[PDB]
Design a protein around this ligand. Structure first.
Ligand SMILES: NC(=O)c1ccc[n+]([C@@H]2O[C@H](COP(=O)([O-])OP(=O)(O)OC[C@H]3O[C@@H](n4cnc5c(N)ncnc54)[C@H](O)[C@@H]3O)[C@@H](O)[C@H]2O)c1
Ligand SMILES: NC(=O)c1ccc[n+]([C@@H]2O[C@H](COP(=O)([O-])OP(=O)(O)OC[C@H]3O[C@@H](n4cnc5c(N)ncnc54)[C@H](O)[C@@H]3O)[C@@H](O)[C@H]2O)c1
Ligand SMILES: O=c1ccn([C@@H]2O[C@H](COP(=O)(O)OP(=O)(O)O[C@H]3O[C@H](CO)[C@@H](F)[C@H](O)[C@H]3O)[C@@H](O)[C@H]2O)c(=O)[nH]1
Ligand SMILES: O=c1ccn([C@@H]2O[C@H](COP(=O)(O)OP(=O)(O)O[C@H]3O[C@H](CO)[C@@H](F)[C@H](O)[C@H]3O)[C@@H](O)[C@H]2O)c(=O)[nH]1
Ligand code: NA
Ligand code: NA
Ligand code: NA
Ligand code: NA
Ligand code: NA
Ligand code: NA
Lengths: 338, 338
C-alpha cells in the first residue's frame, strides 16, 4: 500500500518505516524535523532495503497535506507526528494543543479533502487516566489525563471518533502505546533525544555511556514489589511490527479500532536498571529521589485484544530491549550526525 | 476598558455589546458573519448609545487577531465566536473542532503574542455531561458531553485551564450558559436564526408568527412534573449584564473563574409554551413527538456562586423572556435586513 507516515523520521516512525519498506509498501515520510535529523533517512532506506520518499513539512499545513495526499495517491496514513514531552507540556500547553490537536485536525481535514479514509494514530495509555484497575483494557472508559500532553491525546481520540461516526467509511486505528524502548538490532538506528532524556531507558543509557552521573529513581515507596514504579515496556521493533499489521489488516475495514500495544506485563525501575547493567557489562549508577509529579505507581497493558484480532503479540524481551539500546548508544554515542 | 468581543454581532454578543457600551467601555467587535449580518451594527450603536468598532474576520486567523489586539490596545477579550448547532456538529464534527477548538486556540495564542491576559469564554452546561445531580454546581467535576459541540466546549475549558496554569497572570472566566432566550426590550434586536431554529423559544416564535405549523414537543414521558423536558431559561439581557460584571470584576484578577449563568430554576416545555401563548395573545399550536436524541430530562443551574462572588443574579422573568421575544419577532418578522 501507499502510506504517508507523519513523524516518520522520529524514533517510533523510523523503525516503522523500515518494517513497512521490508514489507514492500511505498512510503512517504512527512516530518518537520523539530525532533529528528535528515541523517536518519539514509539509514531507513538502507535498513528498509528500499527508498522512502521524504517531504519536509508540518502537519499543521493543511494545504500541503492535501497536496501530498493527492500527489502520492496515498491509501493510508500513519500519524506519529507531534510533541510528547510531558513536563514541557505543562509549561507550554498551547504548543501541545497546537501541534497535537490542531495538528491532527489539519491532517485529517486534508485527508477528507483528498478522499483518504484509512488512518492509524499514535495514542497512549495516558488516556486511561488514573485507573486503579490494571491491567488496562480497551473496554475501560477513558479517564482524565493529568498533563496537557495526555489530554491532547485523548482529545484527538475523541475527534477521530466523532469523525468516523460522521464518515462511516473511514477505518481509524487508535493505537495506545505503553512505554516504548529499544532500538533496531543493527545498532544503527534508535532513539536520539536531544538534551536531558525524559524517559527511563535513554537516561539509563546516558548514565551507562558516561554522560551522566547517576540515575535518579523517582520514588521508592510505591506499593509495588520493590518500591519502584512499574510499567509495561515494549520494544520499538515490536511496536513497529504492530503498526504494519494494523495497517495491513484494518485498511478499508470501517470503524474505530482501538488496541493497546504493550507486552502485557510490568517491570519495575529496578528491573530495567538491572537488565541494563547486565547488557552494558557494568553496574549502572543510581540513587533514590522523590516521586515525580503525576507519576502513577504501577500499570501495564492487557494486550489480549490485539492478539485475538490482529494476531499480534510482542516477541522481544526486556533483555533485548536493554541490549539493543546499549548497542545503539554505544555504536553512536553522538546519535545521528548533523 | 478596551474590549474585543469576538462573535459580537451574534445573538448573545450583540446584546452584550450594547450593555458594554452603556457602561462606557470601548468595544471592538470581531466577527466573520457566518451567522449574523452587518445590519445589526447600527442597532448596536443606537441601542448602545456609542459607536463600537467592527472588524470582519475569523478567530482562526491568528495574525489578524494579534494585529487587532495590539492595534486597539485591548485589555480584555470576550469570546462568543464559534459554531453551536448541536445536531449539525454530529454530522460535521471537524468544522466544530476547527472553529471552536482551533478557533479559540488561535485567538488565545494571539493574545499571548500581544500580551493580553484577561479572557471571558462562552461555555455551556453541556460540560457537566450526564449529571444526575441537579442543580449543577461549579464544584462538580465535568462529565462527557454527548455531541462534538459539547465536547468542543469542554476541550476549550481544559485548554484554557492549562494555559492559566502556565501563565498564572491570566484571569480567565469560564461562563457556563444554560438556555438563553429573550431579546432586547426595544424589540429591535434579538435572535435571528437562519432556517429551522434548533432551540425551543425561536421555534415557538416562528409557529406563533405564522411561519410554522406546530411545535413538536420532543418527548412527553419524562420523569418530570408534566412529562416534558425541564431546563433553566435565562434572558439574554441578564446574560449580557452578567458578562459586563464578570469582565469588570475579574479583570486582572488571576485565576480561572468558573460561574454558572442561569436563573437557578427549571421550567418545562409546556411552561414555556404557555408563557408564549400568553405573550402573543393566541394559543401556540403544538403536538407531542418522540424524544430527541441526546436530550436530558431535567436540569437547571445552581447560580449561588455568581450571586455570592459577583453579586449577579437574574432579574428578568420567564414572561418577560417570552414577551420580549414576541415583540422582536413581531416587529421584525424578517429579522435583520440583508
Ligand atoms: N515515545 C513514547 O514514549 C511515546 C508513548 C506514547 C505515545 N507516543 C507518541 O508516538 C508518536 C511518536 O513518538 P516518538 O517517540 O517517535 O517521538 P519523536 O519525537 O521521536 O517523533 C515525532 C516526530 O514528529 C515530528 N514532528 C513533531 N511535530 C511535527 C509537526 N507539527 N509537523 C511535522 N512533524 C512534526 C518530529 O520532528 C519527530 O520526528 C508521538 O505522537 C508520541 O506522542 C510515544
Ligand atoms: N445560544 C445558546 O443557546 C448557547 C448556549 C451555550 C453556549 N453558547 C455559546 O455562546 C456563544 C454565542 O452564541 P450565540 O447564541 O450568540 O450564537 P451566534 O451564532 O448568534 O453568535 C456567534 C457569532 O460567532 C460568529 N462566528 C462563528 N464562527 C466564527 C469564527 N470562526 N470567526 C469569527 N466569527 C465567528 C458568527 O458569525 C456569530 O455572529 C457561542 O460560542 C455559543 O456556542 C450559546
Ligand atoms: O529519570 C527517570 C525516568 C523515569 N523514571 C521512572 O521510570 C518509569 C518510566 O518513566 P518514563 O518517564 O520513561 O515513562 P512514563 O511511564 O512516565 O510515561 C507514561 O506516562 C506519561 C504521563 O502519563 C505519558 F505522557 C506517556 O505517554 C507514558 O508512556 C516511571 O515509573 C518513572 O518514575 C525514573 O525513576 N527516573
Ligand atoms: O423544537 C423543539 C426544541 C426544543 N424542545 C425541547 O425544549 C427544551 C430546550 O431545548 P433547546 O434545544 O432549546 O435547548 P437544549 O436544552 O437542548 O440546549 C442544551 O443542550 C445542548 C446539548 O447538550 C447544548 F448544546 C446547549 O449548550 C444547551 O443549552 C428541551 O427539553 C427540548 O427537548 C422541543 O420540545 N421542541
Ligand atoms: Na452523519
Ligand atoms: Na529533548
Ligand atoms: Na547528536
Ligand atoms: Na510554569
Ligand atoms: Na441556522
Ligand atoms: Na431574514
Amino acid at each position: 500500500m501507499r502510506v504517508l507516515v507523519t513523524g516518520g523520521s522520529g524514533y517510533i516512525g523510523s523503525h516503522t518505516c523500515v518494517q513497512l519498506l521490508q514489507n514492500g509498501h511505498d512510503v512517504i515520510i512527512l516530518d518537520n524535523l523539530c525532533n529528528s535529523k535528515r541523517s536518519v533517512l539514509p539509514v531507513i532506506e538502507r535498513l528498509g532495503g528500499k527508498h522512502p520518499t521524504f517531504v519536509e513539512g508540518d502537519i499543521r499545513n493543511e494545504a500541503l497535506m492535501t497536496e501530498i495526499l493527492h500527489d502520492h495517491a496515498i491509501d493510508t496514513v500513519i500519524h506519529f507526528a507531534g510533541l510528547k514531552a510531558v513536563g514541557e507540556s505543562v509549561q507550554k500547553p498551547l504548543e501541545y494543543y497546537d501541534n497535537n490537536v490542531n495538528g491532527t485536525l489539519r491532517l485529517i481535514s486534508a485527508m477528507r479533502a483528498a478522499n483518504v479514509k484509512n488512518f492509524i494514530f499514535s495514542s497512549s495509555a495516558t488516556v486511561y487516566g488514573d485507573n486503579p484497575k490494571i491491567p488496562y483494557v480497551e473496554s475501560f472508559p477513558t479517564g482524565t489525563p493529568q498533563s496537557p500532553y495526555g489530554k491532547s491525546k485523548l482529545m484527538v481520540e475523541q475527534i477521530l471518533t466523532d469523525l468516523q461516526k460522521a464518515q462511516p467509511d473511514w477505518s481509524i486505528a487508535l493505537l495506545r502505546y505503553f512505554n516504548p524502548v529499544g532500538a533496531h538490532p543493527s545498532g544503527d538506528m534508535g532513539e536520539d533525544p536531544q538534551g536531558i532524556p525524559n524517559n527511563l531507558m535513554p537516561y539509563i543509557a546516558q548514565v551507562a555511556v558516561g554522560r551522566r552521573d547517576s540515575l535518579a529513581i523517582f520514588g521508592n515507596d510505591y506499593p509495588t514489589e520493590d518500591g519502584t514504579g512499574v510499567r509495561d515496556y515494549i520494544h520499538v521493533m515490536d511496536l513497529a511490527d504492530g503498526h504494519v499489521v494494523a495497517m495491513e489488516k484494518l485498511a478499508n475495514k470501517p470503524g474505530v479500532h482501538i488496541y493497546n500495544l504493550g507486552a502485557g506485563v510490568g517491570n519495575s525501575v529496578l528491573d530495567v536498571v538491572n537488565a541494563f547493567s547486565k547488557a552494558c557489562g557494568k553496574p549502572v549508577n543510581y540513587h533514590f529521589a522523590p516521586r515525580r509529579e503525576g507519576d502513577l505507581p504501577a500499570y501495564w497493558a492487557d494486550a489480549s485484544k490485539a492478539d485475538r484480532e490482529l494476531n499480534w503479540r510482542v516477541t522481544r524481551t526486556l533483555d533485548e530491549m536493554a541490549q539493543d539500546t546499549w548497542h545503539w548508544q554505544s555504536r553512536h554515542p553522538q546519535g545521528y550526525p548533523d
